[PDB]
Amino acid sequence: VITEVSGFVRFTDMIDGQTITRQTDELTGLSSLVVLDSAERTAGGKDLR
Amino acid sequence: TASFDIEANGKVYVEKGRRITARHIRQLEKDDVKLIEVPVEYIAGKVVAK
Numbered sequence: 001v002i003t004e005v006s007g008f009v010r011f012t013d014m015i016d017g018q019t020i021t022r023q024t025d026e027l028t029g030l031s032s033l034v035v036l037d038s039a040e041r042t043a044g045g046k047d048l049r
Numbered sequence: 050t051a052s053f054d055i056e057a058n059g060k061v062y063v064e065k066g067r068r069i070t071a072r073h074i075r076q077l078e079k080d081d082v083k084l085i086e087v088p089v090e091y092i093a094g095k096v097v098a099k
């Protein structure tokens with residue numbers, strides 16, 4: 001998903017709990033905010049890509 | 050994926066937002082946790098039978 005310009009990265013229209021879930025990697029340590037699809041989340045975050 | 054806090058006897062078993070894993074099932078089975086409190090928003094998704 002490489003970019004073209006250089007700068008900072010922020011979260012836009014990314015509400016935790018609905019748009020993204022907290023899945024911490026156990027056996028590695030380097031956790032990441034796993035972005036889910038439109039099927040798992042409800043209508044509260046379905047219209048918020 | 051429990052949208053509320055599944056807790057009983059003052060002990061938190063499933064946090065609000067965390068999905069139910071196998072360890073939560075083992076805790077709820079070994080501790081014999083049957084009765085819990087649910088919010089009013091959870092029943093809106095259910096379908097009455099009778």
